[PDB]
Design a protein around this ligand. Structure first.
Ligand SMILES: [Zn+2]
Ligand SMILES: [Zn+2]
Ligand SMILES: [Zn+2]
Ligand SMILES: [Zn+2]
Length: 1256
RNA sequence: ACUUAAUGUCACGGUACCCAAUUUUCUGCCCCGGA
RNA sequence: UCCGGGGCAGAAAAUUGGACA
């Protein structure tokens, strides 16, 4: 009469600490522990315990089982009506039974008059224990009628004691409102394992065989026990790893202090994130050394992977360490190294019923994420690792979907389906029987684990202070995300009288068909489009409970093989299971057509990009063979076809950027983004996008790229470099590069994207969104980074038709002048040349006073202030002399290295074979001119450089001789110089944004006969500038800015090709294509939020007037690169809540702008003695502008036959190209005698000074 | 035993959720001396 | 006293703050 009962699980269950009820009544946090298994300590300490299950719980479950089984057959066994029950009374005759218990107990109506009485006891009460020697709370004997010994754990390696951290893990659970999204509270819980500790053993004894068939059959029926499924079955009869966690600590220290020796402490954090990101690639990168080896020799290497530690290269120490500890595995290796480095850096800084089954597959049509607390939550009682959040993970690194979240989301959607929502109550004494609760307590779910087991992906998110459009400090964090395209199994049970049509509603709503994308919104962070799911291969089954109960038991409820059902053939089904017809499909279901479907409405559209596009992701760049600095973002996706990551990634733009763009747009428009009372900001932005109080009402997604294959080379190298405003050469450590996507004005990129709206918007709210969309289509907000220099502009929008008609209407309804200035610089009358001979100097210097005007106040970017203007300008760029702009991406474009090794060749800057000028160069040119005009601060100047006259060393560096007032404008408090104020600086984004230049009208290539490519040139020799000759000795000072001259001295080289190629070594010449005269490029600037006279001065600077021109391009001092700019069209629009739209401006208004700007500079001069009156402006009254214009003055434009001779001096008189008898060389010009130093300085600071006879 | 009480366990009664543009600044440029 | 040669190849700041009594 002994029955050994074995228990089994199929899903991770829960555990809680043990207590006596005498003590348990106190610790309220143990109260929930009345249904979970028990875990007891042992050995007067921690970590050594035992696990069991209280027999009482098994008893209660068997009771509920017998109750249901009897309710089904209308209350009889084999036709024997039995007793209606006895419980719910137990009053005042003894102790109220421990575990006072309440729920809708049920009693069928019966006929018999015996209650399983003493002499004749129907099996039910014998099973209860009513007629025995039982005793309420006394257990003196093992004298019971039917006994339940408690169930304890089964373990094969029990020779050692179970450790708590081995079979337990902490987790947090919470609860959210029906509306407002937010959470209200949270409790803690312990989850077990179900793979290795899932068997539980017990023991049961009986006394009277008479009641067996009831119990032995009612056993298999029960399903839940301790919070999961089960199958009760009657049974017939490596410590170094830990040391590793410490030992690697040691090694970490060595790496740190060495970096401290070279004054490189901040790069530690970069190294940490990079070595973490190394997690995806695999071991190969170390064992074959695919690390981004440095540039060409440089006698150095990568600025990171080649630092020296203890006299060794880092990229070798890494291989050594991996060889040391290779038992752990690549994954934990990298993770531990990252954590250790993070911590060290942080320390250093400081009426019948039936059962319906649903099987099927879940798919995730977007990147998903479920969040958990943090690492370092050991099970018993500011260590924040370098991952501010984490995805959940299983034991073997697999993605899980815990039944908690599935249950919750199912409830929320069902609650919408009905229409009435009971906000859940805690610990009540009655049951809120609104229908939603009635359904919600009849369903059962199951967890889910995928097959993919690779590490996740990382993303970053920053904030942006709308004050100055800058990275808002103290806000930079990163989240983890799972791959898109994974698939889980999904199981949903139901038991009752009639399949509620609203359950069918929600299932259909989660379904996906040919033209219907599902919208199941599992998981958190559903605000920015993470978590959307869909269903596939739904196959609903149903039982017949009323007359096939033995067929249900014999298959143990078909629990534990829920995978077989999805794929088996209809014929091999187990007897008693039948496919479900009458599945109403999306048509008759009234709630779905009525309450669900209009929940979310989608908008879908494609942006069209017409320029290079770049979303900087600097971290990935450090682990790629490109040796670059910035790369386009990359997403990776699963593919259900091949069960592996797709071999080729996909470029995109992250959703959060989408969201930020719309947010800033609407905010800046309504003028609500600047107020600080935003926790309760009652303006419309807080209603739409949602502050912390309520949820949000817009959901974005990722911008994907589809027009990708048509391009043959997606990513095009580009280089950029600063220039010392004092010597027109490259500053030190200031030559970098980017590698963005290719985007042309003719073959534009194509990006597709979507975003959802929750039903309930009220009229004008739609108007705001539509306005912002039209505003993007106008082209004010650039996608990506580096806006001001052209990257990432937009050029149109094509709203797809399958949208709300309201949007189509609201969006579609909303969509010869400027001659030259004629300044007549008056610097004329033959330049005193007399046509005979005057060898001038290639470049000259310019002095610009000392005082600088500054403004403490700053104009913000909060909103389009009404008193200021904003618009765009179009322009055409016309060339005057052969031009050159090399393309540094290629080094053998002209195939010339096949004969003369080491000889560089280039070809003109081009994109998909469409000539084009990079804009940043135009930005630099305009900026130099504007600064020099307005007497700004030196933007980019190398202070740390010492010279030695010839040994006279420099007592102080260059920055010492230069006045302090002219040093770079550094801090926001001190104020900003007018130059830096307009174009911006490190902490204030500029307000003027240029753009690339397009190509136009004809004759193009200066054709030469002798040269092999017939259109290329071989430039002369070029050497570095020498600030020494400009500063003769110690007492000298920085003269000023540098400028190059205009002359037709290039054609000389156009006839010495054959000779130049002879004498000069091919290691120092460069050959490239050239563009001739007579070409015009398209060009345009866009400005927003300017003051009044600033725009006037900018316009004056774009075109100084007739007879004047800028300089640009490689090879300035020889004469290549004279350029003249005109204006064609101006647009200004004072955008605001008013209906004022884009309007033109006629001529004679720009006159007012320029005139007012002129007076502002008049005032800044402070010497009011200058003429004051009303007349067409005359620029050549203020001293320094006079010189500035005297410098850049095309002589040969007006008088077509007045050209001077400009050239550098030969070296030493018997130098190579020494003009005989000229006496135009050093050692007769640089000697202190025959030329006092002050006279040299004076000759360098008076433009257009005769130099061969050396007058003035 | 450590480890339960017996004519009365809705904890499958509770989603770790809300909110936050990887961005701001920078012309692919160029002459006189070294032991 | 004799006779010629390339350099720069990334620099600075931000690495988490609030919430749910
Ligand atoms: Zn009875
Ligand atoms: Zn309710
Ligand atoms: Zn608000
Ligand atoms: Zn400044």
């Amino acid at each position: 009469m002994n029955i050994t009962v074995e228990l089994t699980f199929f899903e991770p269950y829960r555990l809680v600490e043990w207590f006596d009820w005498d003590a348990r009544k106190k610790s309220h946090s143990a109260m929930r522990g009345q249904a979970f298994a028990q875990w007891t300590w042992k050995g007067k300490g921690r970590t050594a315990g035992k696990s069991f299950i209280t027999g009482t719980l098994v008893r209660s479950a068997v009771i509920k089982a017998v109750e249901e089984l009897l309710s089904l057959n209308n209350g009889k066994w084999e036709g024997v009506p039995c007793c209606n029950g006895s419980f719910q009374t137990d009053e005042s005759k003894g102790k109220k039974p421990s575990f006072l218990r309440k729920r809708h107990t049920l009693q069928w109506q019966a006929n018999n008059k015996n209650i399983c009485d003493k002499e004749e006891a129907c099996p039910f009460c014998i099973l209860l224990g009513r007629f025995d020697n039982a005793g309420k709370v006394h257990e003196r004997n093992k004298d019971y009628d039917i006994h339940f010994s408690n169930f304890d754990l089964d373990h094969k390696q029990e020779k050692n004691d179970l450790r708590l951290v081995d079979i337990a893990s902490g987790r947090i659970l919470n609860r959210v409102d029906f509306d407002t999204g937010k959470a209200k509270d949270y409790f803690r819980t312990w989850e077990a394992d179900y793979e290795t500790y899932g068997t539980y053993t017990g023991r049961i004894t009986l006394r009277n065989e008479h009641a067996k068939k009831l119990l032995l059959a009612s056993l298999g029926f029960v399903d839940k026990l301790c919070g999961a499924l089960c199958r009760i079955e009657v049974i017939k009869k490596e410590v170094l790893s830990e040391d590793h966690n410490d030992e690697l600590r040691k090694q970490a220290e060595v790496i740190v202090e060495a970096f401290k020796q070279n004054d490189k402490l901040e790069k530690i954090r970069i190294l940490a994130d990079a070595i973490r990101t190394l997690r995806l690639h695999g071991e190969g990168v170390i064992e074959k050394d695919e690390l981004p080896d440095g540039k060409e020799e440089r006698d150095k290497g990568h600025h990171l992977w080649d630092i020296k530690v203890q006299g060794t290269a880092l990229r070798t120490k890494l291989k050594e360490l991996w060889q040391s500890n290779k038992d752990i595995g690549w994954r934990k290796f990298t993770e531990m190294l990252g954590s250790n480095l993070y911590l060290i850096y942080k320390k250093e800084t400081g009426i019948e019923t039936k059962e319906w089954i649903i099987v099927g597959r879940l798919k995730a049509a977007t990147p998903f994420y479920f969040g958990v607390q943090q690492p370092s939550d050991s099970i018993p009682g500011v260590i924040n690792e370098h991952t501010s959040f984490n995805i959940l993970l299983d034991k073997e690194n697999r993605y899980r979907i815990p039944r908690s979240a599935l249950r919750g989301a199912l409830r929320r959607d069902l609650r919408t389906a009905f229409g009435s929502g009971c906000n859940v109550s805690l610990g009540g004494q009655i049951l809120c029987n609104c229908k939603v609760c009635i359904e919600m307590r009849r369903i059962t779910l199951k967890d889910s684990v995928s097959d993919f087991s690779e590490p996740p992906e990382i993303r970053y998110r920053i904030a942006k202070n709308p004050g100055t459009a800058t990275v808002e400090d103290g806000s930079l964090f990163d989240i983890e995300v799972g791959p898109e395209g994974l698939t889980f199994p999904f199981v949903l049970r139901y038991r009752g009288h009639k399949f509620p049509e609203q359950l069918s509603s929600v299932i259909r709503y989660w379904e996906e068909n040919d033209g219907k994308n599902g919208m199941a919104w599992l998981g958190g962070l559903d605000s920015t489009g993470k978590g959307r799911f869909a269903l596939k291969d739904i196959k609903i089954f149903e039982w017949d409970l009323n007359q096939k109960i033995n067929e249900y038991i014999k298959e143990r409820g078909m629990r534990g093989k829920e995978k077989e059902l999805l794929e088996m053939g209809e014929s091999s089904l187990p007897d008693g299971l039948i496919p479900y017809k009458f599945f109403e499909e999306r048509e008759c279901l009234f709630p779905y057509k009525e309450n669900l479907k209009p929940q979310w409405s989608e908008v879908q559209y494609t942006i069209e990009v017409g320029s290079p596009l770049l979303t900087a992701d600097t971290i990935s760049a450090l682990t790629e063979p490109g040796n670059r600095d910035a790369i386009a973002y990359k997403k990776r996706v699963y593919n259900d076809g091949n069960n592996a990551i797709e071999p080729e990634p996909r470029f995109a733009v992250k959703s959060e950027t989408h969201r930020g763009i719309f947010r800033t747009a609407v905010g800046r428009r309504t003028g609500d983004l600047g107020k600080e009372d935003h926790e309760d900001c009652t303006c419309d932005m807080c209603i739409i996008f949602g502050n912390e109080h309520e949820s949000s009402k817009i959901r974005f997604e990722d911008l994907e790229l589809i027009n990708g294959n048509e391009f043959e080379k997606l990513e095009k190298h580009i280089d950029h470099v600063a220039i010392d405003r004092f010597t027109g050469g490259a500053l030190d450590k200031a030559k970098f590069d980017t590698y963005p996507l290719a985007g042309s004005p003719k073959k534009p990129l194509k990006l597709k994207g979507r975003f959802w709206i929750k039903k309930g918007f009220s009229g004008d709210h739609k108007l705001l969104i539509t306005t912002a969309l039209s505003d993007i289509r106008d082209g004010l907000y650039p996608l990506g980074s580096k806006g001001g220099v052209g990257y990432g502009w937009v050029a149109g929008i094509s709203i797809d038709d399958n949208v709300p008609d309201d949007f189509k209407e609201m969006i579609n309804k909303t969509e010869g002048p400027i001659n030259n200035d004629y300044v007549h610089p008056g610097h004329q009358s033959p330049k005193q040349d007399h046509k005979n001979k005057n060898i001038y100097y290639p470049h000259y210097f310019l002095d610009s006073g000392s005082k600088v005007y500054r403004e403490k106040d700053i104009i913000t970017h909060e909103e389009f202030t009404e008193e200021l203007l904003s618009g765009k300008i179009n322009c055409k760029l016309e060339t005057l002399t052969p031009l050159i702009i090399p393309d540094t991406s290629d080094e053998n474009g002209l195939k010339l290295q096949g004969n003369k090794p080491g000889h560089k060749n280039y070809k003109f800057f081009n994109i998909n074979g469409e000539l084009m000028i990079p804009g940043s160069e135009l930005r630099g040119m305009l900026r130099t001119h504007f600064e020099a005009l307005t007497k700004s601060c030196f933007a980019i100047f190398g202070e740390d450089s010492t010279l030695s006259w010839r040994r006279k060393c420099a007592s102080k560096t260059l920055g010492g001789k230069l006045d302090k007032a002219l040093h770079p404008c550094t801090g926001l408090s001190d104020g900003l110089c007018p130059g830096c104020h307009l174009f911006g600086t490190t902490d204030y984004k500029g307000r003027v944004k240029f753009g690339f230049a397009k190509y136009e009208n004809g004759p193009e290539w200066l054709i030469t006969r002798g040269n092999n490519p017939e259109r290329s040139l071989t430039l002369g020799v070029l050497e570095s500038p020498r600030p020494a000759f400009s500063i003769p000795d110690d007492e000298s000072e920085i003269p000023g800015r540098k400028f190059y001259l205009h002359h037709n001295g290039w054609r000389i080289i156009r006839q010495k090709q054959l000779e130049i190629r002879e004498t000069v070594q091919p290691e120092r010449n460069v050959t490239t294509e050239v563009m001739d005269k007579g070409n015009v490029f398209s060009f345009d600037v866009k400005f927003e939020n300017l003051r009044e006279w600033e725009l006037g001065l900018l316009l004056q600077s774009l075109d100084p007037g007739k007879n004047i021109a800028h300089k640009l391009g490689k090879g300035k001092p020889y004469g290549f690169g004279s350029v003249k700019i005109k204006i064609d069209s101006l647009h200004t629009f004072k955008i605001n809540s008013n209906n004022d739209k884009i309007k033109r401006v006629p001529q004679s208004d720009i006159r007012e702008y320029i005139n007012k700007g002129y007076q502002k500079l008049i005032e800044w001069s402070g010497n009011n003695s200058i003429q004051k009156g009303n007349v067409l402006p005359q620029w050549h009254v203020i001293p320094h502008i006079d010189k500035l214009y005297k410098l850049l003055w095309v002589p040969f434009l007006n008088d077509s036959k007045l050209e001077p001779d400009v050239r550098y001096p030969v070296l030493n008189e018997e130098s190579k190209g020494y003009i005989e008898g000229s006496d135009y060389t050093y050692k007769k010009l640089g000697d202190k005698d025959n030329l006092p130093y002050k006279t040299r300085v004076k000759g360098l600071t008076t433009p257009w000074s005769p130099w061969n006879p050396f007058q003035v």
